[PDB]
DNA sequence: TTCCTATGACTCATCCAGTT
DNA sequence: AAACTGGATGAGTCATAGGA
């Protein structure tokens, strides 16, 4: 192992934990986009229900 | 002396430029929708507070 | 066989952070 | 210390999977 050799198999792992970590950062941004659409589904229905027992505007 | 292989890299290297613009744009694309959706749903939460005050809970 | 791209993995040159 | 020690980012290149 030169310090370049040591260094390379170690950088190679820090490039790794980051692809793994970059995978998670988008799988979550998919979920915050999911739940927000389930919340807009239930919320505009809720409005149409209380809307009905009063007026249309 | 030359480029057999310098054509295979200058093309693979375009392809990695390309594959990486896609991931860049699905990521900014979803994040705008997290801001957008967020915004619709506060307005709707307010309209629901209001119609449950016009009428009730 | 043979060719060709799209994506994972590894290397390189930076650059940044903690730490004393 | 804008230079120790070692991790971490961006972009080219390598190894492979899939496609035709």
Swiss-Prot record, chain B:
Protein induction: Translation is induced by amino acid or purine starvation, or during growth in low or poor carbon sources. Translational repression during nutrient-rich conditions is dependent on four uORFs (upstream open reading frames) present in the 5'-UTR of the mRNA; these promote ribosome dissociation. Translational induction occurs in conditions reducing translation machinery efficiency, leading to ribosomes scanning over the uORFs, and increased translation of the mRNA. The rapid translational induction is followed by transcriptional induction at later time-points, independently of the uORF sequences.
Disrupted gene: phenotype observed: Abolishes recruitment of the mediator complex to the upstream activating sequence (UAS) of amino-acid starvation responsive genes. Decreases RNA level of genes involved in amino acid biosynthesis and cofactor biosynthesis during amino acid starvation or methyl methanesulfonate stress. Growth dependent on amino acid supplementation. Sensitive to amino acid starvation. Sensitive to purine starvation. Decreases cellular glycogen levels during glucose starvation.
Region (Leucine-zipper): 30-51
Domain bZIP residue range list: 3-57
PTM comment: Phosphorylated by the cyclin-CDK PCL5-PHO85.
Residue ranges, annotated region (Basic motif): 8-28
Subcellular localization, as worded in the UniProt entry: Nucleus
Span of the annotated motif Nuclear localization signal: 8-26
Domain of life (superkingdom): Eukaryota
Summary of subunit composition and partner proteins: Homodimer. Each subunit binds overlapping and non-identical half-sites that flank the central CG base-pair in the pseudo-palindromic motif 5'-ATGA[CG]TCAT-3'. Interacts with the mediator tail; the interaction with GAL11/MED15 is direct. Interacts with the SAGA histone acetyltransferase complex. Interacts with the SWI/SNF chromatin remodeling complex.
Function comment: Master transcriptional regulator that mediates the response to amino acid starvation. Binds variations of the DNA sequence 5'-ATGA[CG]TCAT-3' in canonical nucleosome-depleted 5'-positioned promoters, and also within coding sequences and 3' non-coding regions. During nutrient starvation (low or poor amino acid, carbon or purine sources), it activates genes required for amino acid biosynthesis and transport, autophagy, cofactor biosynthesis and transport, mitochondrial transport, and additional downstream transcription factors.
Comment field on protein domains: Residues 89 to 100 and 106 to 125 define the N-terminal activation domain (NTAD) and the central acidic activation domain (CAAD) respectively, which can function independently to promote high-level transcription of the target genes.
Record-given protein name: General control transcription factor GCN4
Species annotation: Saccharomyces cerevisiae (strain ATCC 204508 / S288c) (Baker's yeast)
